[PDB]
Amino acid sequence: TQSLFQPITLGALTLKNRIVMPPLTRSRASQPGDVANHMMAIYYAQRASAGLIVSEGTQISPTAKGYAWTPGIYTPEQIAGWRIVTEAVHAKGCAIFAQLWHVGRVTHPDNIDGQQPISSSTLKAENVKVFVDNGSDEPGFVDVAVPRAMTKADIAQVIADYRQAALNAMEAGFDGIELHAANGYLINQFIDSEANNRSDEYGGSLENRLRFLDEVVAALVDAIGAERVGVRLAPLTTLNGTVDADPILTYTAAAALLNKHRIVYLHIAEVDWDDAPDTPVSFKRALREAYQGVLIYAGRYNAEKAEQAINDGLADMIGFGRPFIANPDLPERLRHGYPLAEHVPATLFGGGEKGLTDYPTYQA
Ligand SMILES: Cc1cc2nc3c(=O)[nH]c(=O)nc-3n(C[C@H](O)[C@H](O)[C@H](O)COP(=O)(O)O)c2cc1C
Numbered sequence: 001t002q003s004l005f006q007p008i009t010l011g012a013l014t015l016k017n018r019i020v021m022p023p024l025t026r027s028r029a030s031q032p033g034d035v036a037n038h039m040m041a042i043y044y045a046q047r048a049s050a051g052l053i054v055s056e057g058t059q060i061s062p063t064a065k066g067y068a069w070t071p072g073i074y075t076p077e078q079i080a081g082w083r084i085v086t087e088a089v090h091a092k093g094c095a096i097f098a099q100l101w102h103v104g105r106v107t108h109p110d111n112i113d114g115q116q117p118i119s120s121s122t123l124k125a126e127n128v129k130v131f132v133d134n135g136s137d138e139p140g141f142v143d144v145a146v147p148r149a150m151t152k153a154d155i156a157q158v159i160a161d162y163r164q165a166a167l168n169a170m171e172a173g174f175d176g177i178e179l180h181a182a183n184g185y186l187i188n189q190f191i192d193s194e195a196n197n198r199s200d201e202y203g204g205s206l207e208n209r210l211r212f213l214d215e216v217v218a219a220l221v222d223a224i225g226a227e228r229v230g231v232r233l234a235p236l237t238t239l240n241g242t243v244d245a246d247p248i249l250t251y252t253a254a255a256a257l258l259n260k261h262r263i264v265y266l267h268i269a270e271v272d273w274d275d276a277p278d279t280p281v282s283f284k285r286a287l288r289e290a291y292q293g294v295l296i297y298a299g300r301y302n303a304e305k306a307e308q309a310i311n312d313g314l315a316d317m318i319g320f321g322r323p324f325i326a327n328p329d330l331p332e333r334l335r336h337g338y339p340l341a342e343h344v345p346a347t348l349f350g351g352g353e354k355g356l357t358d359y360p361t362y363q364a
C-alpha cells in the first residue's frame with residue numbers, strides 16, 4: 001500500500017494519494033430539476049480522503065439523460081447544486097472532476113422530454129433497460145427505445161453541449177471533467193464497431209469510429225484546458241451492449257488518440273458488476289505506452305491488487321467503486337487493513353440519505 005499512499009500530480013493539482021472514488025450513479029438528484037443537492041454534498045465530502053473524486057455521471061443536456069433522478073449539469077440550478085458539492089469536497093482537501101454524461105441510445109423518451117434517443121446508428125441496445133419515473137406510471141425499469149442516427153448537425157450540437165457542460169463544470173467549481181466514453185453510452189456507441197453502422201466519416205474504419213471521440217475531446221480541451229480533461233473508456237466490458245470486433249486494437253488506438261490531446265488522465269473501467277473480463281497485462285502495457293498521462297484503473301481492486309498495479313508500472317491511480325459506497329473512509333481502511341463494510345444493493349439508486357450518507361467510518 002506504500003505506493004497507493006504516495007501523492008501524485010494531476011495537471012495543476014497535487015493529489016494526496018493514488019486512490020480514486022470513481023463515478024458512482026446514486027440517482028439522488030432533487031426533483032424536479034435533477035439538481036445535485038445537500039445529501040450528495042455530504043456524501044461526496046464524506047469520501048474526500050480519496051486522492052480524486054469523479055462525480056457520478058451527470059447529463060450534459062435534457063436528451064443526454066438515461067435514468068431517473070441522475071443530476072444534470074446544464075441548468076443554473078444544477079450548476080449551483082454541484083457548486084455546493086465541490087465546495088464541500090474542497091473544504092476537505094480533495095480534487096473532484098465531473099463525469100460528463102450522454103447516454104445516447106441507452107434511455108427512454110420519458111427520460112428525455114418525449115424525444116427519441118440518439119446514437120451513431122439506428123441500432124437498439126438489445127435487452128437493455130433504463131429506470132423511469134415519468135410521474136404517471138409507477139417508477140421502474142423499462143426497455144430502451146430505438147435510437148435515431150445522429151446527423152452532422154446533431155453531432156455539432158452534442159459536441160456543443162459537451163463543451164458547454166465543461167464550462168458549466170468549471171463554473172460549478174469542479175477541478176476538471178471526465179468524459180464518459182464507456183459502458184455503452186453515446187461515445188461508446190460510435191467507438192465499438194458492432195454499435196456503429198454509419199457510412200459517413202464517423203463509422204466504418206477505426207479512425208472514423210474514433211472521430212466523434214476525437215472531436216468531443218478537442219472541444220473539451222479547447223474549453224477548459226487539457227490539464228482539466230480526463231476520459232473514461234471500458235475496452236472489454238460490454239455494459240449496455242456495445243461490442244467491438246477488435247477491442248484491444250480499437251482502445252489502444254483510442255488511448256493513442258487521447259494521448260495526442262494530452263488529456264490529463266485516462267480512466268479504464270475494467271469491471272462492471274459481474275462483467276469482469278480478463279484484461280491482459282500485455283494490453284495494459286500497451287495502454288501505458290499509447291497514453292503517457294495519468295492512467296487510472298477501476299474494477300475489483302483491493303489494497304494488494306491496487307498496490308501491485310502501481311508498482312508493476314501499469315497504473316498511476318486506482319479507483320474503488322463499490323467499496324467507496326459502503327466505506328466513506330475507504331483509504332484509511334485500505335491503509336490499515338481494517339475490514340470493509342459491504343454496500344446494500346437495494347439503496348444504490350434513489351431514496352434519500354439511507355444507504356448514502358449513513359455508512360459509518362470505521363470504529364473498532
Ligand atoms: C452503483 C454504481 C454506479 C456506477 N455509476 C457509474 C457512472 O456513473 N459512471 C461510470 O463511468 N461508472 C459507473 N459505475 C462503475 C464504477 O465507477 C466502477 O468502475 C465499477 O463499479 C468497478 O469498480 P469496483 O469493482 O471497485 O466497484 C458505477 C458502478 C456502480 C456499482
Ligand SMILES: Oc1ccc(Cl)cc1
Binds near residue numbers: 069349
Ligand atoms: O436512476 C435510477 C437507476 C436505478 C434505479 Cl433502481 C432507480 C433510479
Ligand SMILES: Oc1ccc(Cl)cc1
Binds near residue numbers: 083
Ligand atoms: O461562486 C461560489 C458560489 C458558492 C460558493 Cl459556496 C462558493 C463559490
Ligand SMILES: Oc1ccc(Cl)cc1
Binds near residue numbers: 025057182183239
Ligand atoms: O457507466 C455506468 C453508469 C451508471 C451505472 Cl449505474 C453504472 C455504470
